[PDB]
Amino acid sequence: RPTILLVGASRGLGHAMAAEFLKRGWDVVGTVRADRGRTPLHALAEAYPDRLRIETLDITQPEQIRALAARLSGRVFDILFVNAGTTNPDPTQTIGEVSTDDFVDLMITNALSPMRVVETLAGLVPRDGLIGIMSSGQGSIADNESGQRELYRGSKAALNQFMRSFAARHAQTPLAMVLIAPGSIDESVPGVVDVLLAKRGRAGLEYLDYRGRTVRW
Amino acid sequence: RPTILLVGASRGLGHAMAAEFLKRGWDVVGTVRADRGRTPLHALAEAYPDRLRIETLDITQPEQIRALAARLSGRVFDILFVNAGTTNPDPTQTIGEVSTDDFVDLMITNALSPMRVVETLAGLVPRDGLIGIMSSGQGSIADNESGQRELYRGSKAALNQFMRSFAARHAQTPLAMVLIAPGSIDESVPGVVDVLLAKRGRAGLEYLDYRGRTVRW
């Protein structure tokens, strides 16, 4: 059975993607923070005790990402998917209004830390494997005609740019990469997984939404 | 005589732009850090003592930007141009390699702080005036086929996105805005100034290089 390493799978879209990959016959290794009591991912492992493994990880600590990579060494995953990021509690703040702490925290959680996950765990994917990262339609600079969610938008545009440079470093390889714009969950998640499955084996980085359409950068 | 407020004018491209605006008959108010001994901008003021004024400002301290805005209150500038940013000393670092300090420092200097300058000093420009910000061709996400300078690229893409949201907030107004890709200095700076002068009175935000060509986002 094919295997996916899904970073950030405790709740929300991450838990839904784990269940959807399980539904399609994949084995899943999903990560959560250890300092949570009990998450939907723990319930899902009780329903799939043979096919879902849970690992704990705070991705804002690079040593923990490295420790996870060392623990999984020798293991090969067909997909690495990074589902990392959050929002500011008041997304209506303008960039001129946010505190320095607001700005630093969200840039670290949404752009630096997912890229560190990709770079550190990339070795657990075959040279022709797939690495996917949860981005957002808000990260598209061409599409930003309306503003709003200003800090979040900037964090996701930096993420997309960082990933394009990572892709450039792999331009001579058959590595497949995708930034996903997820676009309730039952309407979005089956598509996201369709898109990931359809992207396997197609080398290079694309920016794709949950219906598989190219998102302008 | 028309007037420009040029933030970041001590040296390099900023000093060259001040001299070029002076050459074309503008009055200039340029800013430098106070904790520098003597800069080319000080030499330029000795050559243009009636038409160049120097103000001191560290733009990474928001209180200082606010103090400058209060000092200039009542004054009207036809152009506000923000020339703010730096690079990492080792631009060949991958995003996975940079220290958290590297990342935070450059995101603050290159994306948060220039946007705070724009937002705080925007009131010193007429409603139909021009605000320009020094971006880079490295900030274009569509154009990033080659990577390199990875941290710098991400800082400038976040800047461009932040500015697009600021533009959205002014969509109903005749404010003119431009992100400049400067593309030695004698080949670039006269063009940059041509582009700024040609952009006055054309409302909305554009991403433009020193020859006036649209840069893809």
Side-chain angles (χ1 to χ4, degrees), chain A residues 1-126 128-171 173-183 188-210 212-217, chain B residues 1-126 128-171 173-183 188-210 212-217:
Chain A
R1 290 191 302 278
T3 45
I4 175 172
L5 173 54
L6 185 55
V7 179
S10 81
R11 253 180 50 87
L13 234 53
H15 160 270
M17 290 177 61
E20 183 75 13
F21 269 101
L22 288 172
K23 180 176 171 179
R24 310 216 189 169
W26 285 55
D27 288 353
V28 174
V29 174
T31 76
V32 310
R33 289 178 57 117
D35 67 325
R36 302 185 182 284
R38 161 177 180 86
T39 70
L41 191 62
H42 290 101
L44 187 62
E46 290 170 351
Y48 288 93
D50 300 333
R51 296 175 43 210
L52 172 59
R53 293 273 308 270
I54 298 178
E55 296 284 336
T56 56
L57 166 76
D58 177 356
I59 60 148
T60 63
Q61 307 288 339
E63 312 82 356
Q64 289 193 37
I65 313 172
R66 288 191 294 271
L68 177 67
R71 187 176 318 125
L72 296 176
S73 167
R75 179 79 180 279
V76 184
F77 297 92
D78 300 286
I79 293 173
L80 166 65
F81 192 94
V82 179
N83 182 50
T86 192
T87 56
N88 186 276
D90 191 0
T92 66
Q93 288 190 314
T94 68
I95 182 59
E97 283 165 5
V98 304
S99 69
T100 308
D101 284 353
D102 290 338
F103 170 86
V104 171
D105 292 338
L106 201 75
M107 290 308 306
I108 283 169
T109 59
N110 286 14
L112 177 63
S113 298
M115 286 307 305
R116 286 171 165 180
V117 173
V118 168
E119 299 254 38
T120 300
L121 307 183
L124 305 164
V125 175
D128 59 346
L130 177 56
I131 306 183
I133 309 91
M134 193 68 76
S135 182
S136 165
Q138 304 288 297
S140 165
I141 304 193
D143 287 353
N144 181 6
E145 301 295 324
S146 66
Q148 303 181 344
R149 308 179 66 179
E150 295 202 359
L151 182 58
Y152 182 82
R153 289 184 169 282
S155 75
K156 290 290 187 183
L159 176 61
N160 292 178
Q161 182 76 306
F162 288 145
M163 194 58 196
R164 288 220 79 194
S165 292
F166 178 91
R169 282 185 271 127
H170 289 87
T173 87
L175 185 66
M177 294 159 285
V178 60
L179 293 156
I180 290 291
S188 166
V189 166
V192 164
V193 172
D194 282 352
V195 170
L196 290 168
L197 295 179
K199 174 65 178 168
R200 295 181 62 211
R202 183 162 71 262
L205 172 64
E206 301 180 73
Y207 187 10
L208 294 181
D209 67 16
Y210 75 99
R213 306 162 301 205
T214 295
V215 184
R216 292 189 305 163
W217 297 108
Chain B
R1 290 191 302 278
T3 45
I4 175 172
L5 173 54
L6 185 55
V7 179
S10 81
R11 253 180 50 87
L13 234 53
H15 160 270
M17 290 177 61
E20 183 75 13
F21 269 101
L22 288 172
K23 180 176 171 179
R24 310 216 189 169
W26 285 55
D27 288 353
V28 174
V29 174
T31 76
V32 310
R33 289 178 57 117
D35 67 325
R36 302 185 182 284
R38 161 177 180 86
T39 70
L41 191 62
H42 290 101
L44 187 62
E46 290 170 351
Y48 288 93
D50 300 333
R51 296 175 43 210
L52 172 59
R53 293 273 308 270
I54 298 178
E55 296 284 336
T56 56
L57 166 76
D58 177 356
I59 60 148
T60 63
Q61 307 288 339
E63 312 82 356
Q64 289 193 37
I65 313 172
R66 288 191 294 271
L68 177 67
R71 187 176 318 125
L72 296 176
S73 167
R75 179 79 180 279
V76 184
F77 297 92
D78 300 286
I79 293 173
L80 166 65
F81 192 94
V82 179
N83 182 50
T86 192
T87 56
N88 186 276
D90 191 0
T92 66
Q93 288 190 314
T94 68
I95 182 59
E97 283 165 5
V98 304
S99 69
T100 308
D101 284 353
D102 290 338
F103 170 86
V104 171
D105 292 338
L106 201 75
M107 290 308 306
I108 283 169
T109 59
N110 286 14
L112 177 63
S113 298
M115 286 307 305
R116 286 171 165 180
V117 173
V118 168
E119 299 254 38
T120 300
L121 307 183
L124 305 164
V125 175
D128 59 346
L130 177 56
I131 306 183
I133 309 91
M134 193 68 76
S135 182
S136 165
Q138 304 288 297
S140 165
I141 304 193
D143 287 353
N144 181 6
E145 301 295 324
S146 66
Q148 303 181 344
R149 308 179 66 179
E150 295 202 359
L151 182 58
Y152 182 82
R153 289 184 169 282
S155 75
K156 290 290 187 183
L159 176 61
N160 292 178
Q161 182 76 306
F162 288 145
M163 194 58 196
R164 288 220 79 194
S165 292
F166 178 91
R169 282 185 271 127
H170 289 87
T173 87
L175 185 66
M177 294 159 285
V178 60
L179 293 156
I180 290 291
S188 166
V189 166
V192 164
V193 172
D194 282 352
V195 170
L196 290 168
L197 295 179
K199 174 65 178 168
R200 295 181 62 211
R202 183 162 71 262
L205 172 64
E206 301 180 73
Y207 187 10
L208 294 181
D209 67 16
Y210 75 99
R213 306 162 301 205
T214 295
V215 184
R216 292 189 305 163
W217 297 108

